[PDB]
Amino acid sequence: THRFVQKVEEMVQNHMTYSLQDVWQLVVEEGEMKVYRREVEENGIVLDPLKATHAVKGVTGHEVCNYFWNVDVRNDWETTIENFHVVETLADNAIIIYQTHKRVWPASQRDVLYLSVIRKIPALTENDPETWIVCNFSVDHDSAPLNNRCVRAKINVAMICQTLVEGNQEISRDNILCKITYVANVNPGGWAPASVLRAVAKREYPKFLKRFTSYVQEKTAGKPILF
Ligand SMILES: CCCCCCCCCCCCC/C=C/[C@@H](O)[C@H](CO)NC(=O)CCCCCCCCCCCCCCCCC
Predict the structure, then answer these.
(1) Which of 204, 208, 210 to mutate to test the pocket of ligand 1 (most atoms within 8 A of CB)?
(2) GO molecular function: any one?
């Protein structure tokens, strides 16, 4: 019932419709992780859509999404931010976050102001696993005005997670696989030199996906499974 409910449903639906389609240049492949990028410059602004897939043993989609969304563990895995805070809590599954990013010479420092929502998308019936999604997308908020010290990036990011699993036995983490699709469409919000930006992305996206997925595996190991 919060004021962004209509926008959230639009953003989530568009991801479920378009973000799972099969793709674009391979940036890196390492184990089960594949990172792809489409080269796109629009009016000189580098928009380069990013899409990655991964298959992570021993964690569920619900777990992966909880850890990606939960701001309390953010600093345990995220390495590209200087500072962040929660501007507003909209619902138990929806918050607005302001954050500033590490500065990359020679461009101005970027900041971002986004709604971050976590949603369970049921299967047709409970015979099949639900999909979990976290969507982070830019919004306006009067408590976080555009400022003169940072260039305001505009983002649409999603992490979409599918969970793949004898007699009376218990399910073990060794027999669960989480298939992750991560998409990032980032508008840097102003001019940035293309070569510099592209080198940063090439390095930082795979770094993040490795670090983040390893983190969840480490923190869930030996804990009861949250489906
Ligand atoms: C050490 C250098 C790093 C500096 C970072 C540059 C600024 C980035 C601009 C905003 C990107 C938005 C990131 C998305 C964040 C959230 O959804 C989420 C929680 O924070 N994290 C990720 O998805 C994890 C996403 C990890 C993203 C890293 C890739 C960076 C994208 C490149 C865009 C370049 C921005 C222009 C800066 C100047 C370039 C010359």
Answers:
(1) 204
(2) ceramide binding
CATH 2.60.40.1930 assigned to 1-227: no
Q: Residue of the nearest CA to atom 30 in ligand 1?
A: 201
User: Which atom of ligand 1 is closest in space to residue 103's alpha carbon?
Assistant: 4
Q: Which of 194, 82, 78, 199 is nearest to 136 (CA)?
A: 78
Task: Determine the distance separating the centroid of ligand 1 and the alpha carbon of 162, expressed in angstroms.
Answer: 24
CA distance 12 to 217: 26
Domain boundaries, the chain: 1-227
Other CB atoms closer than 10 Å to residue 57's CB: what's the count? 13
**Residues 58-82: b if buried by 16+ CB within 10 A, e if exposed:** bbbbbbbbbbbbeeeeeeebbeeee
Ligand 1 center to residue 82 CA distance, Å?
Answer: 11
Method of determination is X-ray
